[PDB]
């Protein structure tokens, strides 16, 4: 299962609510098109590693104003653990995102 996350509040509340899960950012925008070729990929993924926390992130939704989309291209993922970023990539690199999961879980 993959949570959509709609605002920072949202998105440093599940930070927090995580404990000791890695968590896995999908942050991708609905105009993009190699992020509508590896969405479902990343909700396979969800399934797969049901210990694992996987947000999704609508860039179109990041505040203007001290956001935590510190983004530059789509779609990007990042790896979270106890808050703190641990990963980051960008590109929809099936084989990348799968194993980035397993070094960082
Ligand atoms: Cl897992």
Redesign the pocket.
């Known amino acids: 299962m993959v949570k959509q996350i709609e605002s920072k509040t949202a998105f440093q509340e599940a930070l927090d609510a995580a404990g000791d899960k890695l968590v896995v950012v999908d942050f991708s925008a609905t105009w993009c098109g190699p992020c509508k070729m590896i969405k479902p990929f990343f909700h396979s993924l969800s399934e797969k ?4 926390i996987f947000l999704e992130v609508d860039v179109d939704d990041c505040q203007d104003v001290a956001s935590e989309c510190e983004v530059k291209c789509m779609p990007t993922f990042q790896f979270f653990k106890k808050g703190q970023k641990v990963g980051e990539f960008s590109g929809a690199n099936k084989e990348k995102l799968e194993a980035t999961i397993n070094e960082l ?1």
Not at 49 to 52: E, F, P
């Open positions: 590693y049901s210990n694992v879980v």
